[PDB]
Amino acid sequence: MFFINILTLLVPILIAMAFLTLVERKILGYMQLRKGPNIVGPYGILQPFADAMKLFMKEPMRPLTSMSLFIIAPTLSLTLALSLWVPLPMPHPLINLNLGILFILATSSLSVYSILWSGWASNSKYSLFGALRAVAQTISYEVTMAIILLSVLLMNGSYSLQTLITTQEHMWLLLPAWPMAMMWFISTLAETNRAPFDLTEGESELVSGFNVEYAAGPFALFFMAEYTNIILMNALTTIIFLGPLYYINLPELYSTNFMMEALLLSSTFLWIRASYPRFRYDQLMHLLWKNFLPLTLALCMWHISLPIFTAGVPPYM
Amino acid sequence: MNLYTVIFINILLSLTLILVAFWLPQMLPFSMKFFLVAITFLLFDLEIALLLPLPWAIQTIKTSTMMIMAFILVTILSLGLAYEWTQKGLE
Amino acid sequence: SAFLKNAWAKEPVLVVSFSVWGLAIIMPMISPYTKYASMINKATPYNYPVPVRDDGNMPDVPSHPQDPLGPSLDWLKNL
Amino acid sequence: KRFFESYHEVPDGTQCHRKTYITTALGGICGIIGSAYSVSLNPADSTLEAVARVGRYTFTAAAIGAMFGLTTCVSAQVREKPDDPLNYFIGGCAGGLTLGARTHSYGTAAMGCVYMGTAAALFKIGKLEGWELFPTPKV
Amino acid sequence: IVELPTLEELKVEEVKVSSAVLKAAAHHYGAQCDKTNKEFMLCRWEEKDPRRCLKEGKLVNGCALNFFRQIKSHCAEPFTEYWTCLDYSNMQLFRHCRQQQAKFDQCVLDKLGWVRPDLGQLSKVTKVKTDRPLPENPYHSRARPEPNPVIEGDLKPAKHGTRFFFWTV
Amino acid sequence: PFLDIQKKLGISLDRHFMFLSAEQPYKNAARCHAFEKEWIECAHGIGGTRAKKECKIEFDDFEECLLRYKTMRRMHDIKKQREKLMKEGKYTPPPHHSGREEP
Amino acid sequence: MNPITLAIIYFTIFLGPVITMSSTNLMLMWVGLEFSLLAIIPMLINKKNPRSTEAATKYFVTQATASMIILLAIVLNYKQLGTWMFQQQTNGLILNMTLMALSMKLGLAPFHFWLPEVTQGIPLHMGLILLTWQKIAPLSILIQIYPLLNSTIILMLAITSIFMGAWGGLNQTQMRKIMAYSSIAHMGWMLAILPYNPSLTLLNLMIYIILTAPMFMALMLNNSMTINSISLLWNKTPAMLTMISLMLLSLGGLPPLTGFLPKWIIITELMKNNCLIMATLMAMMALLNLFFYTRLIYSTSLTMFPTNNNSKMMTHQTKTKPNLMFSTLAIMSTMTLPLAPQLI
Amino acid sequence: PSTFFNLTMAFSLSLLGTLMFRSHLMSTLLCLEGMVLSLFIMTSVTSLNSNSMSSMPIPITILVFAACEAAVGLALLVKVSNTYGTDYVQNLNLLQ
Amino acid sequence: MNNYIFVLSSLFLVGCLGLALKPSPIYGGLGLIVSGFVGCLMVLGFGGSFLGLMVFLIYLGGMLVVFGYTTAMATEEYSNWLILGFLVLGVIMEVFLICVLNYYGDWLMYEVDDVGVMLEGGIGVAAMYSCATWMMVVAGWSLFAGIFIIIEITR
Amino acid sequence: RMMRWNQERRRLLIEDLEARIALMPLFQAEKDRRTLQILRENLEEEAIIMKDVPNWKVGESVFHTTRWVPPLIGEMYGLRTKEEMSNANFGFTWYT
């Protein structure tokens, strides 16, 4: 069985990953007074499969670049994204990593290597700058990203994502800790290099440094990775802060509710992209080492004291 | 093992895709300012590592101590950050 | 005070930032519950309570813990 | 190590073969170490040049080792005196002379003879009088 | 040698019921049968060796089996319903099943006369006077060395003074 | 140590945790706790020069609880020769090695 | 330096040795060593001259690898004895590592190459701290573990240092490096008696500190890093010529002055312990150290080197005075010998 | 067991590295770190199989001090390729 | 597979071998990353979780990340193949040495408390806040000073 | 709400910890009983494995003390099936 449970939890996500690009190229469209892709297939449903096949068929250009690293970075990217979905605590999570959140944090950090190495391997000036810019923003947003989680955990009692289903049986962790949700949402927008924070492949400012030289199959794999992440991080928002209803008798309700909230917050970063111009590099980092990091540090204290002075220490189960 | 099984499928799925990609289509910066930020990162990362143990410290019978200790950790590092600002190091 | 005001309206994060820093440095000191944390966590029975030799003159819980003598957590109950 | 020590076990002036062999090794060992420091610092120009210097120092040192061993042992047999420190001095005397030659300098042979021989003689006395070097703390 | 006890010495009837069964009756077993257990604990602690409390362990087991035989005889059905629901949960959490727990608890109070121990009152340390001899010299402690002797007396100005090279001092 | 500002001040910031038998968190004794005690209550009042010869039984044992090398050795021998007995078909694991058992 | 930073650093450079000395848990002794390494590096590059960056980058790599080796010894011990501290039972190789490592941080013998070079590129002031308040820490660790270390190695590092220090000094003309070389030598005597009578190490150090601290504040009074520079002392400030003369001969072992006592009692203790081989050779080349000390004497005092007209200008202006410490540490050093019995 | 001899030799192989520069300061600062990892792994390993929980603080104190140690090391490195345009050690030969 | 542990140790050794060969600073950083990964694996193998994570979120995290960053800046110029060759040379020699003792996972998890409820890695290190309160004060001072040391050394 | 919920959650936690507190006595006996069996069973095979070996005390405490030193995991399952040993060794790290 366990193998079947690996197909499910993977394929299903990959098929959904494909349908996100479509729901991105249509929701951005209707917001901009245009139908979006509806001519290939019925209502554009076959559109994601179509360019996948074009991308893989087109020549994988190997610039005259460190081959090993050039090819590895894509592999790492996809590997990490698909891996980060293993311990997610949808009911009866695939793998009850006791320290799951730490695992999520860890793999999320490793991704940075891909962009960095890709730029270095590409050997193009645009790519180099992209990597440097990317690593800096990525790691920095990791520093507030991690502290925001530590505040959460201390009110959950453990690192296991499964505990929050029992922590959020009466109220979402948004009510409490909303100030961090916002700061988790903005950090989730940075770490998936989505729009407001997409200086990694600004295209206009610098031309897609990450994949300047990447085309065809390598382009696709990161590509796939980004979008799967886009979902995963949104899904982590939908477990950590927006806690879906859960009933031991009926475990499905959780998944269904998890679906609805994940799709809406996934819809939100699509909506954010069309709605906002892109932050500058300096502006981006300032916001995090300056506008947020002081906010995130202080609340950490408040969340350390809160349990004690409220004698609300959580069970360690 | 269960994790090992999942992960190797994960790498296999990727490596399969890159290969298909290649096999199917047969037919000097001066980031000094950054440098500084990077170092602070290293430092802050380490603090965070010293703040990670809290989830179990919250359980310490010596709750007060934990509070004082923890509060100090965050506060002291906060000061370090502020200094960066005061000395205008980061700016 | 005046700067405080503008600070509340300009650079209104630090203000909030510090305010919290303090409020977390105060609530613990004044709280009808602060004491409970060290108790509630103290009480949790993680390790087995090894028995004691009933040598004599023992005011401890008399054998069956259901006996009246001994510590109680009714404070935890109805808390 | 049981080896080097053997030099001392058999009475001096006897079994010169083993004496000379042992003495030659010690010199050679010192040669290697000495060349090593000489190559690590004050490096050479080409690997070969340095391999040569190792050889030069090793052989020179091995030679001083041999003649010391040979002269002292033989001086003993001939003189029919096995514990006369002078034996060693003659040996050290010779050893210095080899060094002098390998450095192509009569003067060095002078200092070499006196200084080196004296040192060796003192070794003999040291052994004869049971002098202790690098002693354990016994306060 | 090792003086490992023989099998016949360590063969005794076994409880062998699913852990779930125990957790459901845990509270009551902590109630009806802690006399012998506490004593066994005392032995196993002060006397470090296990061989030194094996027999007590046999007594430990005997006390529970009948505990079960009583419940099997009376209010078996309630208990059966309570454990089955308790077992389904992955961490066999007690709160998912409270309706089944109430009927199981009320009945045995009604028939067996036992009582579910109120929150706590099981964690509290117990006093059991094991008639076994409180052991000594455990860990075959053996022997200790003699403290260096003590120089005794009172100080008197040093003799002839600092005796350093030519210093009348 | 060189300057005992700790004993003098009475503080114990560095002594409470220097050996395995010291207080363990949540009173969970560490391994080997049965010997180090026996090997330091022995060498207490007797200086080292004489904690090194007569209190050698307790270190030779504590050197074996921790390292646990003599055991490794004995067992390894048992393994090797058992291989030789199996080699001579003399021995093969019984159901003792593989069988059902008490809780 | 923002005076706040100056405080944090200086506190660390001072908390560094003090934690080492006070603690018994070796680990805490290691971090005391680590804090000293971190605190000293900022001060070393204060001028930020091209020579300085070289100095610090060497000092740091030499200090860092030695620090890692000391930690490895503590980590290994932890497995050979659960204790976090060296004991009678400690494997001999475990202790020898600590000797080599600690002899690198202190810079003794075949690891004496970093010190002369870092002493050359750092200011005279930070030179003193790098020579004397950074030797206290490692030596403390050794003195604590003396009962266990090897008599053979120490002696070899001791003798080597004496020789290297002496020979190196003979050629040097830069003062900073003459002192660096002397320190290597004195450091050698200190480590020679450690296995036998640690209490004398603490005398051969204090006296070295009470001798070197006045000597350096003398070199900087006129900030002369050259002998030629110190030779014109007679014009810049004539009085210090008298005591500079005695302190340098005191640094070497000449008998009336305080400097003889450390060598005399170390020789007495080594002969008491029977090293009359080792002690003799050490004392003999110790005499080489005085030769280069007296060569400086010649240039600075006994003979008057020619000076520059522009010097008359520096005379006119009032000379900023030497701190009081100079005097109190010059006299207690040049002449306390009549009070030796109590000192030991 | 043997696990420890591999880690120990790893530290010696890292030792041989830091003591034999190859024209790259960065690489060295990177080797130096290889030790700290080996020390951290060995300290954690024995603490874990001695069940000595009172000592786990150390495995981390080792890393915290080692990180800053490295921070200082890299700032010196950046200082060097600001004064000489390279991290190459040969450049560091002015103090002769 | 009892050999699991030995296998890991070997990988770690090999990785440190590469770092020892001192390849391009970036190659070195990569190698260490692999070793650090091996390291957390081994620690976890014994049972320590929090401990294993740390090296990951610290070494496999920024520790090499900044190195990486750093190198980009100060390491510009790319025999690595020859280095790779020597690496294989070392590998076989390494293997040869183990084969030496070959002619001449038995005991891990040496001792365990089968029933236990508050034993787990991290709890012990959590005692930095209680009964080990001098480790973390000195570490905090280390960081608070290091801020200042780096800001002037860069200044 | 969070304050009240965790206070309730804490009450449930103390309840089930105490539930084992009550049940461990039954398990402790069980463990020891079974543990000894494994040691003894290994004794039988022990008394049949190195019998031929000269100078072979069937078994003897690696130590001198007669104190009861608990059996390492290896000792208990070392001679036994590989899987058995592996299970114990790598059987928790690998979840259910």
Ligand SMILES: CCCCCCCCCCCCCCCCCC(=O)OC[C@H](COP(=O)(O)OCCN)OC(=O)CCCCCCCCCCCCCCCCC
């Ligand atoms: C008392 C106990 C302790 C608790 C105390 C609580 C006090 C009240 C709460 C205070 C803080 C509330 C807000 C927290 C998040 C915002 C933090 C912040 O300060 O914003 C920084 C930045 C705006 O900064 P800027 O305009 O540049 O000016 C800075 C002036 N100092 O922000 C930005 O620029 C963000 C840019 C975002 C671009 C994309 C925007 C997307 C908007 C739609 C999504 C919003 C988030 C949705 C989250 C859903 C749930 C996860």
